[PDB]
Design a protein around this nucleic acid. Structure first.
Ligand SMILES: [Zn+2]
Length: 362
DNA sequence: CCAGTATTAC
DNA sequence: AGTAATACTGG
């Protein structure tokens, strides 16, 4: 279609030789564990405690997910293998079958429903160490120490138990440590202070915070592999709220959505995407890379920026800002947004051919 | 056997 | 701390 041209990316993180190399990816996003822990407390959660989470502006959507939530990661890996080298730092783009797909804060909000508005002024000063100092010796607080303390606390007049549950939720789902066990990494210091203030925790843009944390994991992952995927059974951790990334490829590519996604009946059309769809069950715990690659086939039907539906416009207006945040100057991405703005699609024929060849003919 | 996962070891 | 290896889970 005639129109302004999209420039090819200055580089890619991996060559197409790596598109068939599988990998075990370890998540750090303990949705199932947190929900199970909450349901199994010997002293059950109070109505106020339960409604804090079930009515939380962001975290209410974690309850619209299937029980025993299990992440499926080969869609994300397929995208990771096609990450473009760009100048922007606040968004990532993946080139599938020659078509750039964007993971920005808007997409993170559309799928999660989490508040992705701008940070309030001097948010880093929120809360204080008083609450944590009431329950943890000076030193390192591990994610498991918060879980243990939560299960060993007695519900009573003060909301300290609710604060602990909030801390557990934040540091298991939103900003989550990689290392576990006896020497587990210290949990996020901001979350420890923020959990002291339940009102602040209800309004803070945890969508932006989880998004920025996921951007860090993406960069660490790409640096780690440095262009080559090893032949190993050792899993690589990609910590943080990865649900938008797990579903992104399926939401942007109809061939994948049709074969691997099903509508979640009972869901409200006002909810974000994660509450309205679910992965179809297969004979395996997750989809294999070969399955994703095969269903990818030769399709050219791919949305660069996943489009919202009418029933979702109020939600996005409620959880996103009006203008995009300032980022580094990026003439390549600029050319993409120009061509997309004119109503034209983007597909680099050569890149498309290499993707198809790498997946289906060698 | 598998992909996702929890846990210890290097 | 950062990373890698082992082996369990629910099929
Ligand atoms: Zn929802």
């Amino acid at each position: 279609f005639q129109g302004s041209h999209a420039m090819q990316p200055l580089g890619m993180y991996f060559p197409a030789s790596e598109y068939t190399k599988k990998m075990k990816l370890a998540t750090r996003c303990y949705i199932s564990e947190v929900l199970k822990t909450f349901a199994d407390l010997e002293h059950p959660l109070t109505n106020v405690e339960k409604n804090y989470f079930m009515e939380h502006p962001s975290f209410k959507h974690i309850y619209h997910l299937p029980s025993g939530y299990t992440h499926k990661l080969m869609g994300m890996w397929m995208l990771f293998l096609r990450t473009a080298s760009i100048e922007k730092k606040k968004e990532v783009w993946f080139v599938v079958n020659g078509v750039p797909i964007r993971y920005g804060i808007r997409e993170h909000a559309l799928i999660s429903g989490f508040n992705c508005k701008a940070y309030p002024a001097n948010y880093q000063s929120a809360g204080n160490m008083n609450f944590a100092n009431r329950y943890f010796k000076t030193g390192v607080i591990r994610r498991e120490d918060v879980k243990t303390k939560l299960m060993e606390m007695e519900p009573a007049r003060s909301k300290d138990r609710l604060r602990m549950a909030v801390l557990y939720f934040l540091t298991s789902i939103i900003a989550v440590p990689t290392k576990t066990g006896e020497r587990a990494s210290p949990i996020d210091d901001f979350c420890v202070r923020a959990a002291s203030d339940l009102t602040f925790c209800k309004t803070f843009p945890w969508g932006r915070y989880s998004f920025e944390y996921m951007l860090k994991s993406i960069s660490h992952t790409l640096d780690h592999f440095n262009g080559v995927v090893p032949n190993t059974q050792s899993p690589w951790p990609v910590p943080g709220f990865c649900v938008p990334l797990e579903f992104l490829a399926f939401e942007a590519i109809p061939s994948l959505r049709e074969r691997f996604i099903e509508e979640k009946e009972g869901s409200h059309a006002g909810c974000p995407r994660m509450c309205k769809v679910s992965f179809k069950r297969t004979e395996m715990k997750g989809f294999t890379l070969e399955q994703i690659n095969h269903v990818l086939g030769t399709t050219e039907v791919i949305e660069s920026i996943i489009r919202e539906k009418a029933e979702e416009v109020p939600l996005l207006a409620e959880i996103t800002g009006v203008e995009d945040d300032v980022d580094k100057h990026d003439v390549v991405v600029d050319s993409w947004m120009k061509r997309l703005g004119q109503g034209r699609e983007i597909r680099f024929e050569e890149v498309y051919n290499e993707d198809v060849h790498a997946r289906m003919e060698a």
